Every structure is written in structure tokens, then in C-alpha cells.
Amino acid sequence: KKISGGSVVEMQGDEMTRIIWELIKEKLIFPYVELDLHSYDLGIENRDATNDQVTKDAAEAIKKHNVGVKCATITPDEKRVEEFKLKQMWKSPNGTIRNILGGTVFREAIICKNIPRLVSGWVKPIIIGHHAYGDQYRATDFVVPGPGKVEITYTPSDGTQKVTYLVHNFEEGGGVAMGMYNQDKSIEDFAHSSFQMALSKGWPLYLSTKNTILKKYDGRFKDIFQEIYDKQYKSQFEAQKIWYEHRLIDDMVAQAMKSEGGFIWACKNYDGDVQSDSVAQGYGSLGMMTSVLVCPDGKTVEAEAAHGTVTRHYRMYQKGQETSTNPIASIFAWTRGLAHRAKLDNNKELAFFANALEEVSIETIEAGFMTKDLAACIKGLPNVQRSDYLNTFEFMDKLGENLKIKLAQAKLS
Amino acid sequence: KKISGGSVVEMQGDEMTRIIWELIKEKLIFPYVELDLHSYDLGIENRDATNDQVTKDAAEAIKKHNVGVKCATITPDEKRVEEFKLKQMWKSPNGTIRNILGGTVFREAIICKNIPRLVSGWVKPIIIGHHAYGDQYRATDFVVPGPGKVEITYTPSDGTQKVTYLVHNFEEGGGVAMGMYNQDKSIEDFAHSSFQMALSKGWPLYLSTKNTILKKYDGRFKDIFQEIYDKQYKSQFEAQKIWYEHRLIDDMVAQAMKSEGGFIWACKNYDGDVQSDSVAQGYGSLGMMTSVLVCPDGKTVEAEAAHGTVTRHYRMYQKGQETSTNPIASIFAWTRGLAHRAKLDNNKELAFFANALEEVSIETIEAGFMTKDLAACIKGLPNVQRSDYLNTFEFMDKLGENLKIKLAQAKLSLEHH
Ligand SMILES: NC(=O)C1=CN([C@@H]2O[C@H](COP(=O)(O)OP(=O)(O)OC[C@H]3O[C@@H](n4cnc5c(N)ncnc54)[C@H](OP(=O)(O)O)[C@@H]3O)[C@@H](O)[C@H]2O)C=CC1
Ligand SMILES: NC(=O)C1=CN([C@@H]2O[C@H](COP(=O)(O)OP(=O)(O)OC[C@H]3O[C@@H](n4cnc5c(N)ncnc54)[C@H](OP(=O)(O)O)[C@@H]3O)[C@@H](O)[C@H]2O)C=CC1
Ligand SMILES: OCCOCCOCCOCCOCCOCCOCCOCCOCCOCCOCCOCCOCCO
Ligand SMILES: C[C@@H](Nc1nc(N[C@H](C)C(F)(F)F)nc(-c2cccc(Cl)n2)n1)C(F)(F)F
């Protein structure tokens, strides 16, 4: 009857994405696929009840079963503490999971040909791999109050000679200073994840640094990537007629705007983070941005939407006002997780299903059925009328009918 | 009968831009302008021979004569050391010059009517206000060879106790660490140049930081800009119905991509570096962008192309293949440098020459004669044929033809009379 899906780790989420997540399971997944589902409720309340232990348990389950699909979750702040009366201000579950798995998140826009892009020549997506460790995000910065000397020092653990460098001698007034770092193993894992992602997609890979300026700091990224490429991955790239190349960051961003798309882009922490919103708006909507965490083994993945829980739409839903929330990124978390599960298990039936759900979602939007965010990209939000879009539940119903028709004609060979 | 040009500091560069540089001088400058030329060879080989002292010499010359025009230069890494057998990995000459001169680098695309953009919304220009001092260009980075503790310390001049901050304790391996800084006074001058540029153009101004992560480092930039705005510029902005607003760099990049253009973008050193190439490409080509470093005094300027030596095109040139590198940005380094020289000396003839060469450049491209990069914006790179563009030297020939006619008509005109 149903396709045997295998073991999948499922992580339930919050707010509007929580509603869509159950609609996806009930209307798109469960009628056709039978899964060994290991479910973890990462809803903000269950996280509070378990003192965030449910988040660590889910990450360990992903490590054992190799495939996880996650719904967007609330990252607590001070207002969230008051809203839910949380015991503590729990940290981001995405950060906790990524730190336990040790992978790199790759974000990819889902492209439908009728949705215009802000950059004219983009025909294929640009997949950015984000090294989410170190650099500015673990740095120590401080105000320099007046004249004085700032130095950075290194004291070896083996008791050998301590090294000291002059950062700056403030002579006239004050200013600011900061120290930051990165780690060899994290960079090596970042490289492995990047090479594995490029090989799975069959696309070339680019790493961006500023090693001409940061000769030691950024040069280490360039050296680690090149040595791992030359020793472990180059023949696989050549056999697929792809390649790896290092580029300076300023040249790289311009090359990305000029390109047609269709490459993997390994980004340092800052470079990947600061442009994520622009890539989403550049291709259309945040609702079309999916993501996958790829571990250096190439075997363990965790897929999820690259956007949040869409709190503003959830507030409208709570007051009975019509919402039109895009489910594509959430749906593609399931198809990408299920497609990886099928690749691990040599499951042709599941691989066919995952691709069929992708085609169904793209064909539906390209046929003119879309949510308000996509209609606004075509027409401009001030010009969007009610007849231009389907609400959140109508669009899920339309996807469910098209998927049923697609699989029914696929069963007729 | 040549135009008396005055004192100009010239800095020769590397690879493809070095070849274009000589063509500009022999075809567009030397036949029409007689200069008191102070030339410094910043080619990678002469920098290696002088142990990079020629770079410091050029910066001091710019300080003395107040006008510098620089060709793009190689900043070496390990690959360049082996290529040229260098004595060491010399620091970027631009970082050295900018950190001696200080100030703000203003960068803006060169717009021709027949060149489609990559960002269709950018109907107005975007001017990048790039802080030229500190941050990554004056950073101290090193390899961490193994387990150990990295700390950053502050020892105040007032004799009180040293302050020690833990950066990271490497426990099981090695990695990298670095320290960087900036100075209150240079941030203040950066703010003043940004506000004054916005008021001169009549456009709003935005400053982008990452103060959500670097609350102290980037918070200082945000605080200094807001302090100077509220106390010295806010009323003037409101008189022109413009404004200044701080933006998170994440929001600013997305906001700029959705925008109509027509604003000044004050950027920190690293961000202004990336945005220079990105904004140039969005309007058409890296070869169509000016860049002028303006020192806090306003008297000294260093003009340059925003792009690099175009190594990839030079590699084709070395193979004996025809290349179509865009020389406009390098030409506008000369015209912008000479225009400031004319302003300092109140040299009407030289001021006319600089503007005339810029007009000839625009007019030549808008007439259909352009390099391959601009033909690709019109036709799309998969569709461009050899018949659609000129190589670098044919294009320089066409410019020289039109400039000779333009300057000949100027000397017969009434304004010269
Ligand atoms: N993956 C994760 O677990 C992440 C979770 N979050 C959490 O999500 C919550 C909300 O964060 P927020 O800043 O609002 O960011 P969101 O991504 O949730 O939403 C921001 C805006 O983007 C638009 N948007 C995003 N996703 C969709 C979609 N699927 N369909 C239609 N429009 C969409 C909406 O615009 P408009 O209002 O104009 O219609 C929305 O208001 C926070 O608690 C945050 O911590 C945040 C980031 C990642
Ligand atoms: N101000 C300076 O002195 C600078 C010096 N450099 C140095 O230059 C060298 C090369 O740097 P790189 O990263 O390649 O950056 P470049 O700016 O030199 O070139 C990158 C790419 O941009 C395009 N491009 C740039 N300028 C032009 C132009 N005038 N006409 C047409 N296309 C152009 C070309 O793209 P395509 O290949 O698609 O045709 C080129 O391959 C390095 O040694 C670097 O240190 C770099 C930046 C600034
Ligand atoms: O057939 C499936 C299709 O279903 C469509 C969507 O289904 C949604 C189901 O989501 C998953 C839930 O299923 C698992 C069971 O979960 C148990 C409860 O899960 C918690 C989800 O939150 C539900 C809302 O309750 C939150 C409790 O309130 C806390 C704060 O309360 C504030 C006061 O309430 C405000 C109500 O609105 C006010 C409007 O003015
Ligand atoms: C989606 C765009 N990515 C991107 N765009 C810009 N600039 C835009 C062109 C604009 F000027 F409009 F803001 N900058 C960056 C960047 C990256 C790393 C560090 C920094 Cl500081 N910036 N990334 C892409 F790919 F289309 F170029």
C-alpha cells in the first residue's frame, strides 16, 4: 500500500510553522508514506518542560538515524520569557542541534519560473554554505577608553615560549579593539561538508575569503580547503566535470550577481550570515528558502525551512484573520530529508515520491496558484487582490489534490 | 601648447591594469597635459626590490603634493610569493597608503544610458562611503599552532592596572586568532565626510554595522555617528528633506537590493570593500566604477580604480590572446585625480580637460563602441559575438580619436577664447 519510508527523526515546532507542519504530514506525507518516525516536540513549551533536554535528545537521535526533518522553532528572548513564563532563557535549538551534529547549513532558494528575481540573470539557485562557528560571533570586543597599548598574546599549553603581538598603541585618544578566533577542526569539518554538498548536487564549489589581507587567519581557510580538496575530493569533482576554486570575497559576490546560478558557495560566518535575507528577497520570498545541515560524513543531514515561525501571520490566525503563509520551504524540508533517506537506503519508491512532491509544488505555483507573498513578487504588494492568492489552508488543499492526481497517474505507468 | 597640469603623484601597478595604465598615459594624457610628474613604481617587483619602501614613499608624496593617481596592484599571498620569488608576503599597498593618509573612500558607478543593469530597480546611483582606516586592513593575525590560551590585553597610559580579556583557550588543537582596532577620531572624521557627502548630493545617508554581535566595537560606530548627526547635521538634513539612519548590515544589504538607489551608504572597511564590487556589478561592470579617497582635510585625494589587476584577463594576454578589459575605471582615476588638481590650483583648462575625457568616455560607449563586459550586459554573455565589442586596444584607439576631436574643438571654442 504505502511506501516504506524508513527511520526519520521529526522535530515539531512553533506558531504558524507548527500548523503547516501538521498539514504537510496529514495531507502530503502520511497518506502515501509509512515511516519509522522518531518524533520530538521542540515546541517552546515542551522545551521548557524538559529544560531543553528534548532538543539535545533530538540531535542525538539524528546522529543515530542520520535523517532529521525539523519545523521552525521560537528562539527565546526576554519577551518570550514573559509570554510563556519560561524557567530559563533557553538557547536557539538550531544552534544546539548544529553544535551537536557538527555540520554546516546550506540554504537554497526554490525557483519557480514565474516568480521574478531581483537579479536578472539568475536561472539556477546559489547554495550558500554557512560556517556557523567562531569569527565575529564568538569574539571579545571592548571600548578602549583612552591612550594605552592593546596587545594579543598566545600562551602555549606545553609551557614553551609565550608570544606577544602589538595590536595598536593608542597615542591620542581612545577607540575600540577586539579579538576573534577560529579552530582547525571546525574549518576542516566546514570543508568536508562543502565538498560533500557540491558532489551530491553535481555543482562546482567556491570558497570566499580575504586571504590577501588576513594572510594568516583567512589563509588557513584557503589552505585547509585546498589540501582536503587535493587529497580527498579532486578526482570526484573532475569525474563529475565540476571543480573547486578559492576567490576573494569582493570578487565572489560580484561573480554571484553576474552568474546564472548553479554553484555551491562556502561562506565564512560573517559573509554567509549578513546576506541570507538578501538572497531570500533576491529569489522571491523567505517562504521559498529551504536549508539542510550537512555533516562532514556526508551521511547525516537535518533539513528545515530557512525562515522562522512567521509570528506575525500566527497572530492573525489567533485573531481569526485570514493568513497566506508559504509552505514550500517547509515542504522541501520533508522532500530533501526523504530524498536523502532514500539515497541511504537505495529506496527507489521513496526517491520517486520525494521528487514528485517537489514537482507538484513547483507546477502548482507555476500554474498560478500561490500564496500572497509570491503574488506580491509578481505584482507588487499594493496591487495584490484577494483573487490573486490562496490562503494558508486553501493552498495546502490545492497541493494535496495535485499530489493525489500526480501519484494516481504515476501508478498507471 | 599642452595644458599645464601641475604636480601629480603617479603609482604604476601590475598585470592587466599596468598595460592599460601606459596606454592611458601615452594616448589620453601625455599628448594634451604637461605634468610635474612624481612617479612611483608600485609594481610587485619594485616593491620587492625596495622592501616595500616605495609604497611608503608614494604615500608621503601624496601627502606633500595632495593629488595621487594609483594603478591597481598585486597584494601577495603564498601563491604570489612563489610566482615572483618574493622576499615576503608584502602587505597591501592600498592598506598602507590608506592608513597613512586616512579618510573615506567614495566609490560610485559610471553610468551609460545603453547599459542594462543587473538590478532593474537601481534607477538612481548609489555612493559607497568606505572608511579607509583600521579594522581588517590594520589587523594582527596569526596561526595558533596547538593547544594554548589566546588573550587580548589593554595597558592604559594612565599607569593603572592592565585589563586582560580571554579570546579563546584552544584545548585539543590549533587554529587562528587575530586582533584588530579602530580609533575614535578616525570614526568621527568618517562620520563628518559621510554627512557632508549626503548633504552635497541631497541624498539620505545610511550607516551599516553588526552592532547586534559586536556591541562594543560596532556600537562605537553607531554611537559616534548618531552623536555627530544630532548635534551638527540633523537640522540641515531635514532642511533638504533627507535623513540619516543606522542599519544592521543584514537589513541594509536587503534594503539596498530592493531600493531605487539614490543614497549614500557609509560602510566600515570590510563592508565597503565587498559593496564596492557588488554595487559596481549591479550597475553593469567592475570596470565602470570610480573610487576617490578623500583625506579628512579635504585637500588631499588619491584616485584609483575600485577593481584589481584583472589577473584572469592578464593570463589570456600572456598566452597571446586578444583581451577586452574595460579601461574606464582606470581612466576615471586620472580624470578624478586631475579634476582635484585643477580645483586646488584653480586651473580652468585642466578642469575642462578632466571633464571632457569623462564625457568622451561616456559618449563613446553610448555610441555603441565598448569592451566585452559592457556588450555582455546588453546582449547577455552567451550571445555576445566578436562583432559586438572592441578589444582593449581598439577601444583605447576609439577613445583617443574622439578625445583628440573633442579637445581640438575646445581650443577653437569661445570659452577657451
Ligand atoms: N529555523 C528556525 O528555527 C528559525 C526560527 N526563528 C524564530 O521565528 C520567530 C519569528 O521570527 P521573524 O523575525 O518574524 O522571522 P520569520 O522568518 O518567521 O518571518 C519574518 C517575515 O518574513 C515573511 N515570511 C517568512 N516566512 C514566510 C512564509 N513561510 N510565508 C510567508 N511569509 C513568510 C513574513 O513577512 P510579512 O509579515 O511581511 O508577511 C514574516 O513576517 C522568532 O521567534 C525567531 O526566533 C527565526 C529564524 C530561524
Ligand atoms: N585596488 C587594488 O590594487 C586591488 C588589487 N587587487 C589585486 O588584483 C589581483 C586580482 O584580484 P581579483 O580577485 O581577480 O579581482 P579583480 O578586480 O582584479 O578581477 C576580478 C574579476 O572582475 C572582473 N573585472 C575586474 N575589473 C575589470 C575590468 N576593468 N574590466 C572587465 N572585467 C573586470 C573580471 O571578471 P571575469 O573573469 O568574469 O571577466 C575579473 O576576473 C590580486 O592580486 C588582488 O590582490 C584586487 C582588488 C583591488
Ligand atoms: O490534522 C492535523 C491538521 O491540523 C492542523 C494544525 O494542527 C495543529 C496541531 O499542531 C500540533 C499539535 O499537535 C500535538 C499536540 O500538541 C499539544 C499542544 O501543543 C501546543 C501547541 O500550542 C497550542 C496552543 O496552546 C498554547 C497554550 O497557550 C499558551 C499561551 O496562552 C496564551 C493565551 O491564549 C491565547 C489564545 O489566543 C488569544 C487570541 O486573542
Ligand atoms: C544576494 C547578494 N549577496 C550579497 N550582496 C551584497 N550587496 C548587494 C549587491 C547590495 F549592494 F545590493 F546590498 N553584499 C553581500 C555581502 C556578502 C558578504 C559580506 C558583505 Cl558585507 N556583503 N552579499 C548577491 F549574491 F546577489 F550579491
PDB file of N, CA and C in Angstrom, chain A residues 153-163, chain B residues 147-151 169:
ATOM      1  N   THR A 153      48.073  38.017  22.775  1.00  0.00           N
ATOM      2  CA  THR A 153      49.103  37.103  23.247  1.00  0.00           C
ATOM      3  C   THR A 153      48.622  35.664  23.131  1.00  0.00           C
ATOM      4  N   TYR A 154      49.578  34.742  23.022  1.00  0.00           N
ATOM      5  CA  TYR A 154      49.304  33.311  22.955  1.00  0.00           C
ATOM      6  C   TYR A 154      50.244  32.598  23.914  1.00  0.00           C
ATOM      7  N   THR A 155      49.673  31.852  24.856  1.00  0.00           N
ATOM      8  CA  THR A 155      50.453  31.102  25.834  1.00  0.00           C
ATOM      9  C   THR A 155      50.302  29.614  25.557  1.00  0.00           C
ATOM     10  N   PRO A 156      51.322  28.946  25.018  1.00  0.00           N
ATOM     11  CA  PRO A 156      51.176  27.525  24.680  1.00  0.00           C
ATOM     12  C   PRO A 156      50.960  26.675  25.923  1.00  0.00           C
ATOM     13  N   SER A 157      50.130  25.640  25.775  1.00  0.00           N
ATOM     14  CA  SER A 157      49.839  24.753  26.894  1.00  0.00           C
ATOM     15  C   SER A 157      51.028  23.877  27.268  1.00  0.00           C
ATOM     16  N   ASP A 158      51.942  23.619  26.334  1.00  0.00           N
ATOM     17  CA  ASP A 158      53.114  22.801  26.620  1.00  0.00           C
ATOM     18  C   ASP A 158      54.189  23.554  27.398  1.00  0.00           C
ATOM     19  N   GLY A 159      53.915  24.787  27.817  1.00  0.00           N
ATOM     20  CA  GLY A 159      54.860  25.546  28.608  1.00  0.00           C
ATOM     21  C   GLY A 159      56.016  26.147  27.843  1.00  0.00           C
ATOM     22  N   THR A 160      55.976  26.137  26.513  1.00  0.00           N
ATOM     23  CA  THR A 160      57.043  26.733  25.719  1.00  0.00           C
ATOM     24  C   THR A 160      56.811  28.242  25.618  1.00  0.00           C
ATOM     25  N   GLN A 161      57.542  28.906  24.724  1.00  0.00           N
ATOM     26  CA  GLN A 161      57.662  30.358  24.791  1.00  0.00           C
ATOM     27  C   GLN A 161      56.349  31.053  24.452  1.00  0.00           C
ATOM     28  N   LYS A 162      55.930  31.949  25.341  1.00  0.00           N
ATOM     29  CA  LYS A 162      54.753  32.774  25.112  1.00  0.00           C
ATOM     30  C   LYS A 162      55.061  33.857  24.085  1.00  0.00           C
ATOM     31  N   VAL A 163      54.141  34.052  23.143  1.00  0.00           N
ATOM     32  CA  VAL A 163      54.299  35.010  22.054  1.00  0.00           C
ATOM     33  C   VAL A 163      53.334  36.167  22.273  1.00  0.00           C
TER      34      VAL A 163
ATOM     35  N   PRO B 147      47.365  23.568  21.283  1.00  0.00           N
ATOM     36  CA  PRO B 147      46.620  23.940  22.493  1.00  0.00           C
ATOM     37  C   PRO B 147      47.303  25.066  23.252  1.00  0.00           C
ATOM     38  N   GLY B 148      46.491  25.953  23.802  1.00  0.00           N
ATOM     39  CA  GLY B 148      47.003  27.118  24.491  1.00  0.00           C
ATOM     40  C   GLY B 148      45.935  28.183  24.601  1.00  0.00           C
ATOM     41  N   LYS B 149      46.301  29.257  25.292  1.00  0.00           N
ATOM     42  CA  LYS B 149      45.380  30.332  25.629  1.00  0.00           C
ATOM     43  C   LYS B 149      45.729  31.584  24.836  1.00  0.00           C
ATOM     44  N   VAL B 150      44.739  32.133  24.136  1.00  0.00           N
ATOM     45  CA  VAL B 150      44.877  33.390  23.412  1.00  0.00           C
ATOM     46  C   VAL B 150      44.140  34.468  24.193  1.00  0.00           C
ATOM     47  N   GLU B 151      44.845  35.547  24.521  1.00  0.00           N
ATOM     48  CA  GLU B 151      44.271  36.654  25.268  1.00  0.00           C
ATOM     49  C   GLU B 151      44.572  37.962  24.553  1.00  0.00           C
ATOM     50  N   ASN B 169      40.575  29.600  24.662  1.00  0.00           N
ATOM     51  CA  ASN B 169      41.511  28.581  25.115  1.00  0.00           C
ATOM     52  C   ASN B 169      41.401  27.395  24.165  1.00  0.00           C
TER      53      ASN B 169
END
